[PDB]
């Protein structure tokens, strides 16, 4: 405790001194205008997805979402948003096969690490499906924390 | 994040023997012993008993850093009194006193 540094009782920390709970929310929207291209939510596949991220999608359900209680860490994908291949001039869909299912998913921030708390599925005033995911994790006082 | 495993406070790891005895070069009949996974809960007993032995010239210890459960013990004795054996004697002594402590408590408790 030499400067403004301090000595904290580890046993007290163990019991629960200054322990806190942290929440973070993610979100995404269904799509824009269906001009020969639409966007949605659905679990992607390594061989049936174009420009897939370097994380994982095996924690996603049918609609690309994760049920509460599931432990999700780091680069793990939480919202399996998909957006059709756009190799053409108009930036719309295209007559391709495996790569037609181009994704546009959302994962956790690379430094995050916790479990899914709550998932909300609604629509905006434009009738567009909206996904919002809240996750949580415990913060336990470290030697770099400020008090 | 990068916090150490609490098991490392008392359980020996791979390649970690409990004790390591090195010979000092700064003085004759003197050794330095490393206690792995062991703080001065035990260490302070050892020094205390060593200093009750009139054939011991030096007995002291230090914990070089609190991040690690390690304990340095330095022992210097008079000629012929191998410091290693001096330590062995200190241990025997401590245990014998603890045995009596237990017995006296149990008796006092029963009464």
């Amino acid at each position: 405790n030499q400067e403004d540094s301090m000595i904290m009782n580890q046993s007290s920390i163990d019991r629960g001194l200054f322990r806190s709970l942290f929440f973070r929310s993610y979100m995404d929207q269904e799509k824009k205008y269906g001009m020969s291209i639409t966007e949605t939510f659905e679990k992607p596949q390594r061989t049936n997805t174009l420009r897939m991220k370097h994380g994982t999608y095996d924690k996603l359900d049918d609609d690309g979402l994760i049920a509460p209680g599931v432990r999700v860490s780091g680069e793990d994908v939480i919202i399996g948003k998909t957006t059709p291949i756009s190799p053409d001039e108009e930036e719309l869909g295209q007559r391709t096969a495996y790569h037609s299912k181009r994704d546009a998913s959302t994962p956790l921030r690379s430094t995050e690490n916790g479990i899914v708390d709550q998932v909300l599925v609604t629509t905006n005033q434009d009738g567009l499906k909206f996904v919002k995911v809240r996750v949580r994790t415990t913060k336990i006082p470290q030697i770099g924390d400020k008090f | 994040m990068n916090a150490p495993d609490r098991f490392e406070l008392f359980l020996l790891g791979e390649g970690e023997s409990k004790l390591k005895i090195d010979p000092d070069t700064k003085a004759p009949n003197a050794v330095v012993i490393t206690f792995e996974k062991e703080d001065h809960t035990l260490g302070n007993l050892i020094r205390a008993e060593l200093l009750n032995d009139r054939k011991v010239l030096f007995a002291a210890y230090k914990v070089e850093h609190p991040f690690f459960a390690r304990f340095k013990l330095r022992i210097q004795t008079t000629e012929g009194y191998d410091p290693k054996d001096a330590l062995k004697n200190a241990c025997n002594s401590i245990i014998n006193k603890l045995g009596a402590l237990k017995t006296n408590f149990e008796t006092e408790w029963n009464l």
């Binding site: 400067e3 001039e89 770099g144 | 990068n2």
Partner: protein, 497 residues
Amino acid sequence: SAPLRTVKEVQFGLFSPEEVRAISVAKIRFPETMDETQTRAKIGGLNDPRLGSIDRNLKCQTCQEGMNECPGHFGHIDLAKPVFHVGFIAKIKKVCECVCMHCGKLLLDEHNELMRQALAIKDSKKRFAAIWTLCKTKMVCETDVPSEDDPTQLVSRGGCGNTQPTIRKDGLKLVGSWKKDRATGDADEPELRVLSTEEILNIFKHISVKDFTSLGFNEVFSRPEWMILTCLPVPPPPVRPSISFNESQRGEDDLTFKLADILKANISLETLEHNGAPHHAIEEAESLLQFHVATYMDNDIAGQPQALQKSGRPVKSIRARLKGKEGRIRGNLMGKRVDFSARTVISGDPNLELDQVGVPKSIAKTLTYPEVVTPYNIDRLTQLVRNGPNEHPGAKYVIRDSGDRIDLRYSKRAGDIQLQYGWKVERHIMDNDPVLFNRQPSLHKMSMMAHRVKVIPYSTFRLNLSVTSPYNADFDGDEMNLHVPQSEETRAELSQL
């Protein structure tokens, strides 16, 4: 492969119209962009007419080279009219205020001791300033110039004989005021009119080499005439990144959009004057071209009319792209973001030696060092490879003599890879490594010092109390930076200095 050299001299100068075309590899003739309008290509005369390549494309002056070792190439724009360079309008004005106007000779000459004193100045930047100062007065292109000896004899050097109009600055145009104004009833009061860029250009071409030198310049690297733009150079994609907005969209650099605007303005003149000319109304298109060119170089020249981009914001001109703080020189050149570095919170640790620093295992694991495989360390290095990239005494990428980088995160040959002498192993940071450690703001040498690494648990940097005095540090949440040396030379340099 050409011989490797270092730069010893930088010679500044101006491009000569012809020179621009000489180095130009594209005529540039279409005020249009990517895909020629839905062709899944570029533009026959813009973006990729053998110019800078784009993703998955090669060509680029037939040299290919992808987009790695492949500098872009310049095209050019043949301007319908001469355009004042926005950065030289002040100088152009001053030069015209020194030269006799449509003569090519300065107002003053040797026949004048005050002028001789100015001419004797070696410092060109001060010389032409002195000359200009003197030439602010008596602005008449007198044909017969009074001799310093027996003034009744004069030198007939003034090829015009008339008066030299004064010049007023008006935005991007210069206004001539032809002195005249004869005392006998104020006849022909200083005739006012905007001086044509072409008039001035021709005058600059008339100016002799002797007169160039007198006002500075350099008949090889800079001429007065080169202050007027007649042929622009076109920056390649590497300079003006086309960008890939969101998902397969464009959003090309402001310069791309602005250069297109210049082409449109130039073409406007090209067809307006050529075909259905409207006499003086053409000047509006001339002004348009002048405006776009001047503003693409510099979006700020007093006159309220700042060029705005259709999105509702100011156009980021070249000047804006490289001025002040966070602008090339001070932004990306004099200071810059670097690799092999770390930052985190510090805490005190009285059990470290003065010159040590406690570095978290996660940082020691992250940052690496390219140690060379020799007969004196191959034993250790092969062990580190076997340890893998998951140990705080481990290692990562292995570099072969071929230049191959072996990513140990994608390898099942941890115990199979045999290091050869001369290879490199990008190992994790080891104890006693020399690293540079500092605190911001850095006010003096003491804020930058080299420490010996000690790999520790937890996630803060650990310091000896006494070293905080020079860092001016405390432990109430301060953060410090690590800079890790890569060459052996720099490790020695830090450890010894």
